[PDB]
Amino acid sequence: NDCIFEVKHEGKVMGYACLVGDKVMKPAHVKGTIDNADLAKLAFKRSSKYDLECAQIPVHMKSDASKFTHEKPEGYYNWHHGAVQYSGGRFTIPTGAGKPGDSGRPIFDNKGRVVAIVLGGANEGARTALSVVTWNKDIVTKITPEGAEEW
Amino acid sequence: NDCIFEVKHEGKVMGYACLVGDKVMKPAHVKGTIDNADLAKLAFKRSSKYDLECAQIPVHMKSDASKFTHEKPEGYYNWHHGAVQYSGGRFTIPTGAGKPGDSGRPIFDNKGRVVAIVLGGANEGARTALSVVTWNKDIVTKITPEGAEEW
């Protein structure tokens, strides 16, 4: 709700940037500038292996940070456009929901904890598979199914 | 119900093929070809140690694969022709059920997960012992009781 800000380029909406923990996170492949005035003056670091960019949150905006964890038990989860089911190590949604330009959405836990950031996916007939960057103890990792395409 | 396909030769049925996980599986001693136009063009690996051949599932059909597990607690299991009993580390079915040409049916748990594939069986008066192939962590194994005959 309050932790999401929009990135635009030449008047067109391209993606979102999320305020998680103590850091500001954004997918690398999305162009444009951040709407918020203060955030646009920050310096960023890049790593092409993980398709991520990050920077430290300024002091006075820290109260808007969301909470997070690393446990990912089997069950059902929710996001903006519907429900998402996790079983066997993969995230899936009904076919046809989700369109290009929605990359940068969070995926939430039952009590509001952030567990994933969604970047693209692969499409087949009845179901679709998501490509996600997640984390674990002290590291982050990238999950990619065959044939995936960016959103 | 939807994951089973037939293998035919000269108009007759001699066995079935099944989709489990991300691979297609077929007993080695069954001849013929697969009726589906797309699966018949796949390249397969052969191993006479375990009487199995496998290949990769094409992308658009993944949604029809079943679930699988490796725990085998004592209890009863379900298959096409009725209930099957597991105790003492061996599979038993009441006598009279099953005829040649019905190899390749999967064995289901209470939650519908595949645990084994049936190839043949032994002859006995009151109850019939099965010869099956199962799996464990990172290995596969063949279980063959005395006196078994091919189906």
- Domain's final residue, options A19, A41, A66: A66
Q: Specify whether B80 is catalytic.
A: no
* Residue A91 vs residues A34, A135, B133: alpha-carbon distances, Å: 28, 15, 30
Q: Specify whether B131 is catalytic.
A: no
CB A51 within 8 A of CB A27: yes
Q: Specify whether B51 is catalytic.
A: yes
Number of domains in chain B: 2
Most B CBs within 10 A among A90, A93, A146, hence the mutation to make, goes to: A146
3-state DSSP assignment of residue B113: coil
- Please give, rounded to a whole number of angstroms, the shortest distance from the CA of B60 to a CA of chain A: 5
Of A49, A9, A45, the closest CA to residue A30 belongs to A9
Residues A59 and A76 in one domain: no
| Chain A contacts in chain B segment 50-79 (CB below 8 A) | 59-63, 67
Q: How was this structure determined?
A: cryo-EM
Residues B76 and B146 in one domain: yes
3-state DSSP assignment of residue B3: coil
Residues A27 and A90 in one domain: no
CA–CA separation, B106 vs A7, rounded Å?
Answer: 51
The single-letter DSSP state of residue B60 is: G
- Domain's final residue, options B28, B43, B66: B66
* Residue A135 vs residues A50, A76, A97, B44: alpha-carbon distances, Å: 11, 19, 25, 37
Residues A62 and A72 in one domain: no
DSSP E strands, A45-139? 45-47, 52-56, 75-79, 82-87, 90-94, 106-108, 114-123, 127-135
> Please, how many CA atoms are within 13 Å of residue A32, restricted to the half-sphere of its CB?
20
- Please give, rounded to a whole number of angstroms, the shortest distance from the CA of A6 to a CA of chain B: 34
B37-56 b/e (C-beta count within 10 Å ≥ 16 → b): eebeeeeeeeeeeebbbbee
Residue A39, phi then psi, degrees to nearest 5: -65, -30
- Domain's final residue, options A10, A36, A66: A66
CB B80 within 8 A of CB B105: yes
Of A131, A145, A141, A119, the closest CA to residue A27 belongs to A119
Residues B54 and B88 in one domain: no
Which range of residues forms the domain containing residue A42? Answer: 1-66
Q: How many CB atoms lie within 10 A of CB A24?
A: 24
Q: Which residue of A has its CA nearest to B60?
A: A124
